Structure 1
Amino acid sequence: TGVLVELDGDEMTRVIWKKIKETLIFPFVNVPIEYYDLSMENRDKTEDRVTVEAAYAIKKHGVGVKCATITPDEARVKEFNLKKMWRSPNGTIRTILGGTVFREPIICSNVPRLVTTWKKPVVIGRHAFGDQYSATDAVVKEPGTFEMRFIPANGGEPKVYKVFDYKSGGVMMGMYNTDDSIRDFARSCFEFALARKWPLYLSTKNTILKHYDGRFKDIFAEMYKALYETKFKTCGIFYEHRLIDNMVAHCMRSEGGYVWACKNYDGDVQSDSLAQGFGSLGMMTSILMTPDGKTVEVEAAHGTVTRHYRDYQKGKETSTNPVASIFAWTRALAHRARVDNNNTLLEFTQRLEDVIIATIEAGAMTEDLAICIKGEKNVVRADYLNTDEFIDAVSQRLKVA
């Protein structure tokens, strides 16, 4: 009754995406899908127009599911003969939608973490706006002065700052963020943690960046005091600012069960460290949530798995883990279901997640999880299923459920 926006992708994830749709989704669910092909080739052909069209379609319809895509760089420009080094589609969509990207591991009882203390999941809430990701940078090739100016819109004295006099070359960068965006990030994070009844931590480096990072600290503190502190206390949870240095140490030590609000760059980096620590990138989920909770975009917290695609391309069997991709579909459909008051669709999504977990906990799993259990040296082919075998096995149990 509502529509689901689908964004097709690249390389190994695109092949798996087709299998997931045809095997675990379309046989059981009839939902109207608006489709956008975000393959590298179609982005180049459409001069990246598909990307922004897809983003606006998610805003219109309320829910999107996205397959991993290639982010061009020098090598990719050569590989595909790109017209331009097109921007990351993820940055474009997240820019258009706004919001915070919540990343969380999927834990199976029988798959150990790499970190021995980790008992419960940790959620990273990544601020998907500003800083490095909309920065302007340049190489300095001659002697000269880098300075910044702030120019008030009502005339009156521009403020100037001399940063550096280069003599023998270097680099320069400026970046910004906004009160509006920081306040939206804070609200998303307080709301997420409150719904979970988990505590909340914000990491910054305000110790060095007294003004830039101090703005994050002050905005979260203001918002906690005004709007959330009483509700948090009543639920037996709390919010705390932490020095980024201390926070990464805490994360190693802690058993989990907290929400961790991260600035754009820290969320990007620490999410991968977290994912890998929990066992595998194939078991890490990602959901962008707009401020208010009414628009989401769900994806796997990993890329296109091009190393595996290379093996796929030369006819070799691959056991890349489809679980995060499937959970993208289940959580997107669950959001679609709730808006639509469709309890049977919602129950289907829960049931598919349940059988995936049951399947793995009983010993049927892809090679990455076999490795977490046995160690890379000790796994043999009979210890795991290939990707299609894993998905076929899941559909079997799904059909009895």
Structure 2
Amino acid sequence: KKISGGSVVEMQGDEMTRIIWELIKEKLIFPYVELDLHSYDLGIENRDATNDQVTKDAAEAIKKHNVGVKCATITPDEKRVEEFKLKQMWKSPNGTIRNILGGTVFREAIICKNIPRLVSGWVKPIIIGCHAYRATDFVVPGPGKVEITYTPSDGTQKVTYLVHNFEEGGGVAMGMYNQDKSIEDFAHSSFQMALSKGWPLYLSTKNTILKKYDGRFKDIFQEIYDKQYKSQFEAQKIWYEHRLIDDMVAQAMKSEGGFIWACKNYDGDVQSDFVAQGYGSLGMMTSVLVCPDGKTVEAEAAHGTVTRHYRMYQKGQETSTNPIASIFAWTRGLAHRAKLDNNKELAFFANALEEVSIETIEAGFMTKDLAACIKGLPNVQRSDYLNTFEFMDKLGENLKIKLAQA
């Protein structure tokens, strides 16, 4: 018979990822695992029909049942409103979920022997927890004074800081904020991730410029480390250090990998997603939202719905979309369920499906993006890769063989 998997919250998504999602469930999960599935459909049409209520219901479900696996969803813009005749420009499902849950998004690239990484010297994995949104910006119509003030709730002295005197013309201005509690949750999630994985932890800031804003992140991380985690770290022969972002980038590129990287960047900096997308590895980038309690987890692929591949599908073209990131959303959620429920058999399945994914690619069977990452797109021939369905069939066949042994 199949494995008892327990309580898992699933969120169905949109376009090309929605197709891969069902393929993953039908071919890789349901043949081997029964789940008490709390399933919510976050397709753009069902969100429109429930006035986004389904999205909020799903977040509440994740918080109740501790484990969510999410499929990529369409975040509406002006064009999606026209495309789907939406009632209004619904806010992002990911923003809504993360707002309800809190926690820290951790990004990790999946490593295969035969896929070169962004930096050749990296050997062990690297996990990036970046705190990035909720700011208020406006236009400065003309000359004038922009000030940012603080008014204590307890009636003590109101304080006023000068942002800028606009002596000539106008421009733009904005205010931004962060709560100590959010920094603290950021801190705790990161230390617990380091001890979980057994890697050292680095925090990168620009506290030479934002001495007070970024300095708060450094101070809070350091207090929490010293009082609540240093001993456990040293027990596992790991460590925590703050690093200027200027130095961290240099340190990372000369490193052998094997660390957690808590990162605090501004709202418009380059994100590891964009680079992975440029390098052609975004189909291998996993994501997991880890709440500060260590109990609740929402796993997802780091990429979006892969609209461009979906349009190819709608035009009768052959597609070769990478399903690994979405598969690891399932394996990380299920592996966490196994940890919570002490399910040895479900833990075995989660690891076994991860190994089959990696072994398959390392044996030479891969989607087009992985072949281009090896050889460069210009030299990629059809015989170098498998299409979306050929590759899912291949994973399925190897998973059945894997599990047929024990």
Normalising by the residue count of structure 2, what TM-score does the alignment of the two structures yield? 0.92
Quote how far apart the aligned CAs of 1:138 are.
Answer: 1.7
CA distance 1:397–1:15, change in 2 (3 Å) = same
Counting matched residue pairs gives 397
Amino acid at match of 2:69: V
1:247-326 aligned at under 5 Å gives the runs 247-263=248-264, 265=266, 269-272=270-273, 275-276=276-277, 280-326=281-327
Identify the residue that residue 67 of structure 2 maps to in structure 1. 63
1:1-400 aligned at under 5 Å gives the runs 2-127=6-131, 133-166=133-166, 167-263=168-264, 265=266, 269-272=270-273, 275-276=276-277, 280-400=281-401
Whether the 8 Å contact between 2:192 and 2:294 is mirrored in structure 1 is: no
Amino acid at match of 1:92: T
- Cα distance in 2 for partners of 1:267, 1:322 equals 28
SS of match in other structure, 1:116? coil
Amino acid at match of 1:198: W
Amino acid at match of 1:103: R
Amino acid at match of 1:393: K
SS of match in other structure, 2:208? coil
- Cα distance in 2 for partners of 1:181, 1:75 equals 34
Amino acid at match of 2:229: Y
- Cα distance in 2 for partners of 1:81, 1:182 equals 39
SS of match in other structure, 1:294? coil
Quote how far apart the aligned CAs of 1:82 are.
Answer: 3.1
Whether the 8 Å contact between 2:110 and 2:284 is mirrored in structure 1 is: yes
Q: After superposition, what is the alpha-carbon deviation per residue over 1:233-278, rounded to whole angstroms, capped at 9, x for unaligned?
A: 3332221111112222322332211110012657984322564587
- Cα distance in 2 for partners of 1:46, 1:123 equals 36
Identity %: 66
- Cα distance in 2 for partners of 1:348, 1:376 equals 34
- Cα distance in 2 for partners of 1:178, 1:26 equals 42
Whether the 8 Å contact between 1:124 and 1:259 is mirrored in structure 2 is: yes
Normalising by the residue count of structure 1, what TM-score does the alignment of the two structures yield? 0.93
Whether the 8 Å contact between 1:125 and 1:267 is mirrored in structure 2 is: no
Amino acid at match of 2:154: N
Q: Which runs of 5+ in 2 are unaligned?
A: none
CA distance 1:246–1:77, change in 2 (3 Å) = farther
SS of match in other structure, 2:271? helix
Quote how far apart the aligned CAs of 1:143 are.
Answer: 4.0
Whether the 8 Å contact between 1:323 and 1:356 is mirrored in structure 2 is: yes
CA distance 1:170–1:43, change in 2 (3 Å) = farther
SS of match in other structure, 2:174? strand
Quote how far apart the aligned CAs of 1:221 are.
Answer: 1.1
